[PDB]
């Protein structure tokens, strides 16, 4: 895509009274938004080429 540099992304789960500490002096791609895991349940990532059908 025109770019010859690379970006490497990382993730972690931050537990409810824990804290995450970033220290950087460059090349940092900073978080702005994070995601609260509100509902854990049984779900899935279905690999399919199709789209919605408005049915149930």
């Amino acid at each position, epitope marked *: 895509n025109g770019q010859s540099g690379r970006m490497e992304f990382f993730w972690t789960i931050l537990k409810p009274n824990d804290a995450i500490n970033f220290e950087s002096n460059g090349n940092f791609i900073a978080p702005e938004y994070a995601y609260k895991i*509100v*509902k854990k349940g049984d779900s899935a990532i279905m690999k399919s080429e199709l*789209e*919605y059908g*408005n*049915c*149930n």
Partner: antibody
Amino acid sequence: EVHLQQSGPELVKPGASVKMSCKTSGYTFTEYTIHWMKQSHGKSLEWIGGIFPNNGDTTYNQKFKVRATLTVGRSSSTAYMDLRSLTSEDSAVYYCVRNYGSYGYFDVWGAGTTVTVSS
Amino acid sequence: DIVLTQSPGSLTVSLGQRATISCRASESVDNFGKSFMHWYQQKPGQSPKLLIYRASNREGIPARFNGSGSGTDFALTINPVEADDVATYFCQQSNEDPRTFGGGTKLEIKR
């Protein structure tokens, strides 16, 4: 973004007919059913109908079955509603709304085309 | 038709307190184990806004809104009440066509 741009406020002689339009933008027209809601000035919301773009299937309320007609222009990415032979009753605001998934919630509501029926 | 009746009709609550708006369904709105109730907010002079889907989960909506309830009766709880909460609130069921809404409840701030 999920913007729904709809028609401009309108005036109709009693007995005539209106055709307000709602132009979809920002998502895939053909994946969600579009619906219409009528709000009697500062009172209560009434459900009119729904239409699924991809094949044009319609779903109406008892109340509006007759007077209303949902249609869709797929190339245009546009949903239309048509109200035939109006009365003072129909003078209110009409919202073009995208419903998510028969058992679904209306997540993106359009601006509101406001119709005025007077001679 | 599943007649939805909200109560009370108008509610005036002091700033920084708790607004508690109720909904009551003529028949249940509650199968598959989930409640198919929805709360909507109409700030004056603009179209309604989606707050809660299936009676409990928030849609960019602040936590001050507590969706609660099951079966025949539910409740939208706004607490703490802020300034920009003047609106009329609507509950609407999706359990069974024809989609029906509540009368709506208008909220006023005591200052």
